[PDB]
Amino acid sequence: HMASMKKKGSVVIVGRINLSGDTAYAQQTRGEEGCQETSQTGRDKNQVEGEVQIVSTATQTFLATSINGVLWTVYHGAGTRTIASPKGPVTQMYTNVDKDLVGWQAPQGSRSLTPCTCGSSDLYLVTRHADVIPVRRRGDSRGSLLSPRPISYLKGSSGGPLLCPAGHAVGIFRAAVSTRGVAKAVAFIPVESLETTM
Ligand SMILES: COc1ccc2nc(C)c(O[C@@H]3C[C@H]4C(=O)N[C@]5(C(=O)NS(=O)(=O)C6(C)CC6)C[C@H]5/C=C\CCCCC[C@H](NC(=O)OC5(C)CCC5)C(=O)N4C3)nc2c1
Ligand SMILES: [Zn+2]
């Protein structure tokens, strides 16, 4: 009935991948209860820091990455959802189902990665467990893992960055290519495609 139609909750930042120092590590900033509540109100007063956020909905958890003042993630994680912010839900400023891409204005206090212009094919994928996985670029939107591993290890890291040797953003992790459950390669949204969307 019209009277009882529910609304979907906001995406909520629940932690980050700390890349500040010599050791990458995941930090949780909000537990499940506060996450649930913040998703419904869309009101998140937690201080945001860093480039790579861990985000959650009621049903999924994945990553989101700031590049050029936009917090980017995958459409298959976020759909058309708002993100929680100190003053309430914030509507997406970019949505592209054809690229599996969405973006919101970057939260106050985040830091943005710089788009790569190195042209290097020696990349590094950052996962939600703060693993930094070397990846050889193999095309415009694909790279191979130098050390394959089960897809379990990459699940939940869509929206994370592929970085060049200098720490610039090369793309946003979108999908894993596997054989008998082993991730041999990854697909990503190239940063140029983000820059065109902008
Ligand atoms: C609905 O509207 C849209 C629009 C455009 C979409 N575009 C894509 C490409 C897509 O694909 C889905 C989701 C994605 C995925 O699973 N993404 C990771 C992930 O972590 N997600 S996640 O964070 O857990 C989660 C689900 C958000 C919470 C990185 C994956 C980690 C492990 C793989 C798990 C097994 C799956 C292997 C699979 N492989 C693959 O499809 O390979 C190819 C055929 C595609 C090109 C080659 C794979 O990766 N996916 C399948 N859905 C779309 C949906
Ligand atoms: Zn670079």
Residue numbers in the entry: 982 to 1179
What did the publication describing this PDB structure actually write?
All of the P4 inhibitors were also tested against the D168A RAS and except for P4-2 performed better than the parent compound and grazoprevir (both ∼50 nM), ranging in potency from 2 to 36 nM. The cyclobutyl ring of P4-2 is actually slightly elevated out of the pocket, similar to the structure of the parent compound, and does not have the conformational flexibility to contour the enzyme. This lack of flexibility results in an unsatisfied or “frustrated” pocket that is neither filled by the inhibitor nor has space for water to easily occupy. Inhibitors with relatively poor potency did not optimally fill the S4 pocket, causing a frustrated pocket that could not be filled by water, a protein side chain, or the inhibitor. This pocket was further destabilized in the D168A variant.
The NS3/4A protease is an excellent target for developing DAAs against HCV, and protease inhibitors have been a key component of most combination therapies. This essential protease cleaves the HCV polyprotein into functional units necessary for viral replication and maturation. Structurally Asp168 is a critical residue that contributes to an active-site electrostatic network necessary for efficient inhibitor binding. We rationally designed HCV protease inhibitors that retain potency while fitting within the substrate envelope to avoid resistance, particularly against D168A, which confers high-level resistance to current HCV PIs.
